[PDB]
From a paper:
Potassium‐coupled chloride transporters (KCCs) play crucial roles in regulating cell volume and intracellular chloride concentration. They are characteristically inhibited under isotonic conditions via phospho‐regulatory sites located within the cytoplasmic termini. Decreased inhibitory phosphorylation in response to hypotonic cell swelling stimulates transport activity, and dysfunction of this regulatory process has been associated with various human diseases. Here, we present cryo‐EM structures of human KCC3b and KCC1, revealing structural determinants for phospho‐regulation in both N‐ and C‐termini.
Numbering used by the authors:
A (entry chain B): 102 to 123, 126 to 946, 1028 to 1094
B (entry chain A): 102 to 123, 126 to 896, 901 to 949, 1028 to 1094
Amino acid sequence: MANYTNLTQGAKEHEEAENITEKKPTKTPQMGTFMGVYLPCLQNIFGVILFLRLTWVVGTAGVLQAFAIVLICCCCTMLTAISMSAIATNGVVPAGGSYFMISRALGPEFGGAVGLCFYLGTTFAAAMYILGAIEIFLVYIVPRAAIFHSDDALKESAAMLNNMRVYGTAFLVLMVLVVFIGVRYVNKFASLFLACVIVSILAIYAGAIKSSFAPPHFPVCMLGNRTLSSRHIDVCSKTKEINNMTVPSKLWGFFCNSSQFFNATCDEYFVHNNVTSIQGIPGLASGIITENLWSNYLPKGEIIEKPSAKSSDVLGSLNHEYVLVDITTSFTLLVGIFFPSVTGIMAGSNRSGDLKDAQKSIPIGTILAILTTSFVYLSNVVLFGACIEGVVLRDKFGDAVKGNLVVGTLSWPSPWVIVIGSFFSTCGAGLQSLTGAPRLLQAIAKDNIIPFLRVFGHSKANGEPTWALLLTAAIAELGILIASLDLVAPILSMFFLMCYLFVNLACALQTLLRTPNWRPRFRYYHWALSFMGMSICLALMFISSWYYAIVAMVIAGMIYKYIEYQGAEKEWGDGIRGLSLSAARFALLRLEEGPPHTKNWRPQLLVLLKLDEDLHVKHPRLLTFASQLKAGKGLTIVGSVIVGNFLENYGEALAAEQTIKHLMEAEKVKGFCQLVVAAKLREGISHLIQSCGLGGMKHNTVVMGWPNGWRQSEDARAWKTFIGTVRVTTAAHLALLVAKNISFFPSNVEQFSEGNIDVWWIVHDGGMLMLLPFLLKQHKVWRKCSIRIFTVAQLEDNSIQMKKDLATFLYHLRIEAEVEVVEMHDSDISAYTYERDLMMEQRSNVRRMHTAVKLNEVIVNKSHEAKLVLLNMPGPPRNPEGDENYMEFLEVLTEGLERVLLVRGGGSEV
Amino acid sequence: MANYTNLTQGAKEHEEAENITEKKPTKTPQMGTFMGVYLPCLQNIFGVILFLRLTWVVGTAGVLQAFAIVLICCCCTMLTAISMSAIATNGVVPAGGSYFMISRALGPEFGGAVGLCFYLGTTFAAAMYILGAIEIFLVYIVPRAAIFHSDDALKESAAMLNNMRVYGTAFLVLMVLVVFIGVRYVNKFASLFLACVIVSILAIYAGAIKSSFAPPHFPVCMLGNRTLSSRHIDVCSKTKEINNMTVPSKLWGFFCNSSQFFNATCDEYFVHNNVTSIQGIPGLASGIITENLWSNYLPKGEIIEKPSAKSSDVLGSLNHEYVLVDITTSFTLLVGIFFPSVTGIMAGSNRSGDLKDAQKSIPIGTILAILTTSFVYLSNVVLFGACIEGVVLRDKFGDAVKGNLVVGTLSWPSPWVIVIGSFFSTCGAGLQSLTGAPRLLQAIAKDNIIPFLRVFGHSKANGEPTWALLLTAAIAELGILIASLDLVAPILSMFFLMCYLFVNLACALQTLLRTPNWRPRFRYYHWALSFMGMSICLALMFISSWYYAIVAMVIAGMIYKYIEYQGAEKEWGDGIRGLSLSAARFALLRLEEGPPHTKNWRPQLLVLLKLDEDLHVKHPRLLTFASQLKAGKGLTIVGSVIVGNFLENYGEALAAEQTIKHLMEAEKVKGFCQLVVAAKLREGISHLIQSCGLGGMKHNTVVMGWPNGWRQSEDARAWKTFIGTVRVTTAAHLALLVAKNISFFPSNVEQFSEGNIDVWWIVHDGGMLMLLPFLLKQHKVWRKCSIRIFTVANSIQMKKDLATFLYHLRIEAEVEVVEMHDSDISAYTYERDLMMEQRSQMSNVRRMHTAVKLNEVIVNKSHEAKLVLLNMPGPPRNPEGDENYMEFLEVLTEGLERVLLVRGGGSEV
Ligand SMILES: *[C@@H]1O[C@H](CO)[C@@H](O[C@@H]2O[C@H](CO)[C@@H](O[C@@H]3O[C@H](CO)[C@@H](O)[C@H](O)[C@@H]3O)[C@H](O)[C@H]2NC(C)=O)[C@H](O)[C@H]1NC(C)=O
Ligand SMILES: *[C@@H]1O[C@H](CO)[C@@H](O[C@@H]2O[C@H](CO)[C@@H](O[C@@H]3O[C@H](CO)[C@@H](O)[C@H](O)[C@@H]3O)[C@H](O)[C@H]2NC(C)=O)[C@H](O)[C@H]1NC(C)=O
Ligand SMILES: *[C@@H]1O[C@H](CO)[C@@H](O)[C@H](O)[C@H]1NC(C)=O
Ligand SMILES: *[C@H]1O[C@H](CO)[C@@H](O)[C@H](O)[C@H]1NC(C)=O
């Protein structure tokens, strides 16, 4: 015993859930995976197409191509089921319909795009289902009751379309009234609709089985290889004997105008060929599948010909009774006509609020439902191929079989069971989609995702959409005006295909780009699956119509970008400003949930500009050299401290910030400026070094200017601060670039004709040292200079192996660089070796000076005339007392060189 | 006297310019706008189509639809010229070709995508032009020298393709050798090629004019309304009299097998109808335009029928001599066949290094060249409509006119001048595109934009592409293997259409989004024009082929994203990490060059978390309330100061940072964390308030916790620091949110059944105060509460504005104005007066005794509220009355459950 439904859950349920945040009523609607996602999805996938058009598709395509069609459609819907299950498992499943899940999983932009595309899909589905119910009623149930009787022969089709337009509009107004007043009854009879569907399918299978030994007696009159209609004929014989008199049969009256055979003038094909009674349903074992295993694709108005019977060759006798191909078929048309029979998988999660284990019921339920329907379709394709005559299949309105439903002829009790079950199922699906479309529309309106749809957010006392339904009815009316399933199906299929394409593309993107909160806890979801689904039914979209598909893509893209713009204006306050703001925030967030390190190290600079008492940059050269080092790309944060109290220096801070920005723009520096008004310059710099940049966009190198004239100034703060900053940089594990004699650094406009960047590679931190000159040489200023590595390791035997390691590394760099190893006494490099030993264990002053002068001797003797001498640095002393000695060591170590870039790694650089 | 060229300038010139950075040689190549951009673009737009296929297109389309085709193509190329001129004016024009301009203007990603699409365009153009030169030579000049003689009927049709494939491959190997050895000669003879083109067009016009009084004698044999070929027939008469004997003419031998008229068995149409000589070029005044003003679109193999002359009705006599439609035409096919006649506008700026005023010569020159060629095409459409028979036009191989070029029949001297000028022009354009494709390829390789193309960066001693040219030759070979202009034209057109679509879309985007360094100094460029061009010829792309267009779009998109990825990995060091890094940096940069303010104010929070001596968050409720306030969207920077020395507390700073990040994620706060290890807590907070966030992603509100138990603690620093922070926030012009009794603030899981957020709106700063409760109510926790505004006081004007804002907000709120004595609100009115005074230029016992009145009213009205917002008075000017200020605040909030003290201190709207 159970009282379930197959409809959706709109804003009413999501709202109840949110309020219920802070139960016995909830527990009772809890439904297992089977009755929660299997039956809703099964009742909503099994549409009208399976009946009114599957036999026709099989016939006009040949079992092979029909199998290919059903397989491609089922493949796009199965990969979309996998992507939708990945969405369902990821995070908490909201209580609303599939729209709320898709929204909370893919962001409001994709949520709204999918919502509107799926909504247009559902409206045109309510239109197709009303057209189908009308077509079944009118062609098969009550043919006599058509308001416009067919006029002559040429206007017979036109008279039918008007019957369908008027009857469909009346029926649509009826269905709208039903859904508006008494949707509870629709919920109650969803089970009866599913019952009708399943009874119909079991009747189809029972007929197919019975058709092996005893097939039914539905014969078709056929003149040679020309199939005849049986809507008016009684006997498939040229002369029907009446009262022992061989009077001509009615077909004679339809091919010869005499009607009395008194010297009757019969046309050519009638006199030459012969009328035969061909069994319309041969046995399943008869082996007709070999006959109908091939496409027909006859264009419009072509006579349907069974390529088995004999025939004469005369032509010209065009007649009304010849059953004709009613539409110029093709593969790309058949795929579109059949696709709305696999749609409805988003209905699997239309009952997600009343579930027990959502992430477990929704994926399994949906995939099992799609497997069931795919098996039913792929089995019925072959059964129709192997049970129905190759002529009764191409009959798209049950003609030539005495006016019975083509699939109806395959049934155990009678074709009547199917002709009524299809009608009830199709009107039920129309009601279902006229309840599912306006609920989704009011949910998209209530979310305030799109502003102008706010009007449709209005609900009834119970939370039913009063003003969304009217728009749904209007769109269904526009659809019904094209009173033909064969022409509504491509549009419906295109809208549902766009919905499925976005559901597959959002999952592929969010898996590749490592989108935050994208944890697809599924045992079989791989982004390649969703990508293959997106590709497959993108191809499907374009195949069916290349112009409708572009219109759908552009509509969805405009809705997506407009939702993004509205979200920007909502959260940041401005449209385009806020749009870039959201882009930056999202990039930084995505940047946070990732490995902290990088496979390669690239210097992101923090230029520490020193501001004089006039609040002017004391060293613009710093900015010029930073621009040359980064070459206008990358991150450059220009930081500076203004000594004083912030409470009264805000105006000065703003003025100096404008000054530094103008200077950066003048020196082609692309980056950002940050001023800190601090009580102590040293503490301000210690705060800039560790706090600049938003998380994930941190710097990793600190670029400083050398404290020129440290000895001259009586105050010891200037030299002591530089050391403090060096210690802060080393402790923070950031790289350090101390530029000395920066006033002589070349400007952005001038250039070097010829020169040598003499990188000095000393025991360690070789990665930063080697990487620097190439970044410099990549700029036009340092472009025309060479590079010389004066390695100072051991003597020569060690160097040969190292020479190979450096030469190959440089080979990977692919920039010319000659390395020379100069033997140096360990004592001369004692301070370095000491620091290295301290590092290895972790993982005097007179000697330092007397060795620094040896370093001076070698460095000047080799590199006196260099344009820029890079040089590795030793760490600062542990005791802050020897800071003067450390600065003297550095000053002597750099005595006599034109332009030095002291470099200290102090990090895991490679 | 001048020696100019129409070829491109690749990496060799761009490199010379860059080196020449730090002249007499440069000055000499300087060329004026006319000879620098008008003639190169004119010489490169006038291709082979104008001759070999324009007459055929006019005929098979009808003058009206042919006019529509030429107009649509010219419209896409003109809008693309406007966008490309906008690119040319914006910024300095690089010395290289058009590729370098497009690159430096649209970024390397679009630069490389457009470069490769335009490169495939140029290669398939070298293929089409070689095919055209071969077709002209073989069909019109020397038919005798064809290696595969046509045989039978079906074999004869495919006999030609083998002649064309072999001759085209031979010609392509010849052209490749020429360009490889002696491109200087091509530069020298570019002028002769342009001369041939212009002489040919003037010959067309002279023929059209002469066709007014005296049209030429090109007759066509026509059997009834069935056109015959005249390659073998001599007289358009059934019987050709020989030696005074009426012997049957050869056409009799081609329709009757007797050949002696001895009881000859002639077929049906031949016996019934008549052969007639129809003047093939009637006068311009003859008025045939009225006849050929309509489309034909006859499918493949259909006999071409003039619907004017008499005819019998018998059918069945299918014959070889009946001129047949050689391809199943359609409108969408004609647009594709014709589009490669308007391509070449990027060649206008292929000589930009040798210019005087680039930003002035390139736009005018390009637009004038396109106007000239568009007028020439639209004029020749009408001239062909009004001068050539409606049957001679649909002849795509000069049949029925004795085997002469269709357009050749319209010329003053003879069709030979055009048939040779077209051949030389088409081989010259082939040479041009076999020099322009590899130069562009080596420029894309040398830019190191795409890695794997590095092999093709290799150049010759003079800087000629040795290995790029070979790939161009291979692709041209693959093109020539499809030995038919009618099938190469759609591919060429698709590649050039993709190039133009990207050039229009990048400009539209960079104009809309306010991309940095996008200054389009043009007098007529509006982004709507580039957008209309993008749309027009996107439609053109898809019309011509919906599957080729998708393949091109996917190829270009993959190249674009791959270039972006390679640039990320190059500059940042990682692929996806660096990709997000570049996205963030670019967004922030774009965010910088814009108005600092915003039309709406939205609170971007900086939560100041206080870290205790255990390095644990002393107030997680701060984060919970920040999450509720921002609702998971927006910017939230959580800042905290660790008192101590940074040299030894780095590990502690990292540990506490991980702690704060875990807490943020636990409280559903989406944002970033920044720790500052400072010697003094007050200075650390004063530095966080002014330095957090990258430029453009700044905060505008500071969210603080109230210093609970300030009086109890003997140390006065705790209460004094809060005031210091308030002053820092006010001075920085940021909003301020002081939360009091924050330990009682509701958690993210619980909710309120019913309650009232009692926003108290006092004289000023009404914008922040009104905006807050609605952002709070937008969260599920505060969803089920009501709002009550207890207004106490241009305050009257402000109240009306607030009411209007409430109406705009559309969320139910009831406002009550309570009369209060000015003395009670004295501290507020005093501050307001100070504000008005400063704006115009551009005690304690009373404050406490009035604060208690404020307490009386506020508690009597709002004692049971769930959250009482309340405006704040400014801190005293003298830092001595700071205790008095804190006492004022403490009493002002005495008795309320949960208070959010709010201070605007900014231009909040
Ligand atoms: C159903 O019967 C009609 C009536 O004869 C068939 O029409 C004709 O069928 C032939 C196939 O034999 C078609 O092709 C012809 O083939 C012969 C083979 O030598 C060839 O000599 C002819 O020139 C022609 O190509 C023919 O086009 C078709 N129509 C006419 C007017 O003759 C029809 O094909 C039969 N159904 C099927 C499925 O074959
Ligand atoms: C060139 O001359 C031939 C020889 O008659 C034309 O063939 C026939 O042309 C007629 C049009 O005059 C076509 O349509 C017919 O129209 C009459 C009008 O009443 C109608 O009674 C017929 O049933 C038919 O629809 C006809 O299809 C066509 N072919 C045959 C076999 O008659 C040919 O059309 C002429 N060329 C042009 C461009 O018109
Ligand atoms: C063919 O020529 C004869 C005599 O010149 C003429 O009478 C007849 O009408 C012509 N046929 C047609 C179709 O004009
Ligand atoms: C059709 O079948 C009949 C048997 O009544 C036969 O006489 C007639 O010849 C058949 N058609 C043929 C062979 O033309």
